[PDB]
Structure 1
């Protein structure tokens, strides 16, 4: 039962842009500051459920505020009073565009050069985040948008619904996560934009986590054609089980992708098929 037409006598809501497991996101006009913004509101249909309300206040509303061209900026948080009860929200940079989850669904895999470019920009966002002490912690296709003018925008950093499909082996065992955990999860995203499939699927979330821990990904070139062995090398280094065997920074990952984009050999160890 509905999201109001206005929040805090300031954000006039327009069209709905999207939804997830917790939120509905609306295009709005900020009447104070004269800005188009995206307002993430607790889903109307879940808003009275204690567990979702409390998760929204703890998680979504505590998205990190970072200032980088490839990071969706966070402007504000608040809570509206409705006759149904409190409706919490977070106000952020409006991206006119779609998520990688959307793109992979509607178009299937990207050309390898596009995929490289997109993930290379995503590396720049993560490296900025990491230099400001913030680990993303939920790198996944739904958290990366491409704009109408083809800019890459990463969102929802630093938060403690959603899928084991992208978690690092260390998150699968509830351990310490660092920059290399972000690298692995971006590795998963890269695999999916290249092949159309994530590295691991399963009947359950505990089944996919098991595969992250114990099972080698099928090399990208085996799952989809037109993908070089140099691309296998970079993807499978990012996807290494031991953090010490992965790219140690997002910058180091980007550098290998830049080599491959330029037709240079990557520094990652060779992977042999067939």
Structure 2
């Protein structure tokens, strides 16, 4: 089995945390330091392609070099052989002590305006660090937005494998669903979807299947937000849910600045003009 396997003679896997399309996330013990960490073990299929392993190493190095409280640190990364499974790429990261936003939203339903706006600004600020560094999260969803006991937001599970090539569809950006490469603006869109849910109590798009919800992200415009909400909060979310990524806030920073303005009582600032590349 996978349990008990010490990757590179250092990371001993113990318990399964998450399961996804890119691979599995395991709770492992670091032989070297003794600390418990989170290890994302990628599938053997991606590892077999040489073009992937090159781009993964490059994206992992830049993500690890990131130092910000709002981001769950990436400690290490590499490749380890397992008997019968072959050479597979892994990623080592911070084992965050907190509650994920999806859990919070299941209990609370609809967050208070003060709290919803606070986490949006925090997530934006944290994303900007990655965006400035040339990285894109690619998987912004409440599951990856962790809330510490103090109240600080920590972003987990960066889309590193998506960089090297239902729950995914519920927050997917239109350009992502269409097959185009993600950009910081895609994270802004997905955080808008998170915002819409946090402020209204319901997601903008639903369906029987994932393909149905993903198509709603491409074609269907978002349903109007509750009338009892302030117009400024309503506008801020509607701006980020625009299908054309050029018409949204370039990155997390400009979005966070906009959230701050709404918190002050001002209309959300207009996104800067798109320069011609």
TM-score clears 0.5: yes
What is the CA–CA distance in structure 2 between the aligned matches of 1:74 and 1:190, rounded to whole Å? 26
- Counterparts of 1:35-46 in structure 2 under 5 Å? 35-41=35-41
Task: Name 2:120's counterpart in structure 1.
Answer: 119
What is the CA–CA distance in structure 2 between the aligned matches of 1:176 and 1:5, rounded to whole Å? 35
Q: Would the aligned equivalents of 1:230 and 1:265 in 2 still touch at CA under 8 Å?
A: yes
**1:32–1:112 distance in 2 versus 1, CA, 3 Å:** same
Task: Name 2:274's counterpart in structure 1.
Answer: none
Asked if 1:181 corresponds to 2:219, the answer is no
Please state whether the residue corresponding to 1:257 is helix, strand or coil: helix
**1:159–1:101 distance in 2 versus 1, CA, 3 Å:** farther
Task: Name 2:131's counterpart in structure 1.
Answer: 130
Q: 5+ unaligned residues in a row in structure 2: which ranges?
A: 272-277
Task: Name 1:99's counterpart in structure 2.
Answer: 100
Q: Which moved more, 1:68-77 or 1:260-269?
A: 260-269
What is the CA–CA distance in structure 2 between the aligned matches of 1:174 and 1:20, rounded to whole Å? 23
Task: Name 2:44's counterpart in structure 1.
Answer: 53
Q: Would the aligned equivalents of 1:68 and 1:125 in 2 still touch at CA under 8 Å?
A: yes
**1:17–1:101 distance in 2 versus 1, CA, 3 Å:** farther
What is the CA–CA distance in structure 2 between the aligned matches of 1:232 and 1:239, rounded to whole Å? 11
**1:3–1:56 distance in 2 versus 1, CA, 3 Å:** farther
State the TM-score, normalizing by the size of structure 2: 0.78
Task: Name 1:247's counterpart in structure 2.
Answer: 249
Task: Name 1:238's counterpart in structure 2.
Answer: 240
Q: 5+ unaligned residues in a row in structure 1: which ranges?
A: 43-51, 270-274
What is the CA–CA distance in structure 2 between the aligned matches of 1:148 and 1:7, rounded to whole Å? 32
Task: Name 1:48's counterpart in structure 2.
Answer: none
State the TM-score, normalizing by the size of structure 1: 0.79
